[PDB]
Structures are given as C-alpha cells and as structure tokens.
Amino acid sequence: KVFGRCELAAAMKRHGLDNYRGYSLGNWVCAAKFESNFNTQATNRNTDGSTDYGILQINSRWWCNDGRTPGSRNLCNIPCSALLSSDITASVNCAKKIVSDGNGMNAWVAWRNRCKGTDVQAWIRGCRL
Ligand SMILES: [Cl-]
Ligand SMILES: [Cl-]
Ligand SMILES: [Cl-]
Ligand SMILES: [Cl-]
Ligand SMILES: [Cl-]
Ligand SMILES: [Cl-]
Ligand code: NA
C-alpha cells in the first residue's frame, strides 16, 4: 500500500508514534516519506547483504528475519515480510524498539539527513488528527 501523507500520519498516531521517545509525529511521517516514499512494500538491498523492509526501511541485520542475512539478529521477532503489510502495526512496533535502542531516530539515515533539524510539523499540516 502506498499511503497518503495524512493517512499515514493517522495510522502512526493511532499506533502510538506521536511523541514516542519524544519524536513528534512529523518526524515519523518525514522518515517514512524519505525511507520508502510511503510504500509499505519498499525493499532495498544493502552492501553487507542485509535488506531494508517496509515503510520505515527496517533492516534485517538486526531487526527482522529474512532467511538470507547470515549471523543477523531478529530483535523484533518478526519475519521481515511482516514489515511489508498494508497494516503498519508490525512496522510501528518494531520502530518503537529501534528508536529505544540508544541512537534515537538516527537509526534511520533518511531521517538524519532529511528530517532532523527541519520543520517536521510540515508533514502533519492540514491533517485531521
Ligand atoms: Cl492522505
Ligand atoms: Cl510534528
Ligand atoms: Cl537480506
Ligand atoms: Cl521469522
Ligand atoms: Cl495500519
Ligand atoms: Cl533520542
Ligand atoms: Na535478521
């Protein structure tokens, strides 16, 4: 599923991301825009052989099992395919774990490079929330 901006903001709000570890909802919607273009089906291979999955591009090195990333962990205890669902529950629940790990939203390269320090409230402007 390719979300609209506000549709994703509502879905993220309802699943408890708004202000989660102190990151306002705009930061999550901004991260999703630049990680996946709001596409739950997005996948991208990394050089190390891991793959990033879903609307928030969660990596199989640490967070999910894809059966082809040797010596990786699955800290979210999910198949990576779960992160591609049109239902973002798995993605959000795994994102909560990531963001809690110590490095905050710096775990998302696109957030650090394109969202951090920017006017992220722009991403939820006009939305009914
Ligand atoms: Cl929308
Ligand atoms: Cl915000
Ligand atoms: Cl992989
Ligand atoms: Cl699994
Ligand atoms: Cl959802
Ligand atoms: Cl933080
Ligand atoms: Na893994």
Is 2:116 a contact under the CB 8 Å cutoff? no
Give the C-alpha separation, 94 to 76, whole Å: 5
Experimental determination technique: X-ray
Q: What single string gives the DSSP state of each residue in the chain? A: -B--HHHHHHHHHHTT-TTBTTB-HHHHHHHHHHHHTTBTT-EEE-TTS-EEETTTTEETTTS-B-S-STT---TT-SBGGGGGSSSTHHHHHHHHHHHTTTTGGGGSHHHHHHTTTS-GGGGGTT---
- Nearest ligand to the CA of 127 is 1
Ligand 7 centroid, distance to 97 Cα (angstroms) = 15
Annotated binding-site members for substrate: 101
Is 66 among the catalytic positions?
no
Ligand 4 centroid, distance to 98 Cα (angstroms) = 18
Is 11:96 a contact under the CB 8 Å cutoff? no
Is 18 among the catalytic positions?
no
Query: What tokens appear for 30 in the block?
Result: 């901004």
Neighbours of ion ligand 3 (CB under 5 A): 51, 60, 66, 68-69
Per-domain residue ranges of the chain: 1-129
Give the C-alpha separation, 42 to 102, whole Å: 26
User: Considering only the top CATH level, what class is 1-129?
Assistant: mainly alpha
How many angstroms is the resolution? 1.6
User: Choosing from 52, 66, 87, 119, which is the catalytic residue?
Assistant: 52
Ligand 7 centroid, distance to 67 Cα (angstroms) = 7
In degrees, rounded to 5, the angle at the alpha carbon of residue 37 between the alpha carbons of residues 66 and 42 is 20
Q: What single string gives the DSSP state of each residue in 94-108? A: HHHHHHTTTTGGGGS
Question: How close are the terminal C-alpha atoms of the chain, in Å?
Answer: 21
Give the C-alpha separation, 47 to 128, whole Å: 40
Query: What tokens appear for 18 in the block?
Result: 């708004």
Ligand 3 centroid, distance to 40 Cα (angstroms) = 17
Give the C-alpha separation, 79 to 66, whole Å: 6
Query: What tokens appear for 49 in the block?
Result: 């052989």
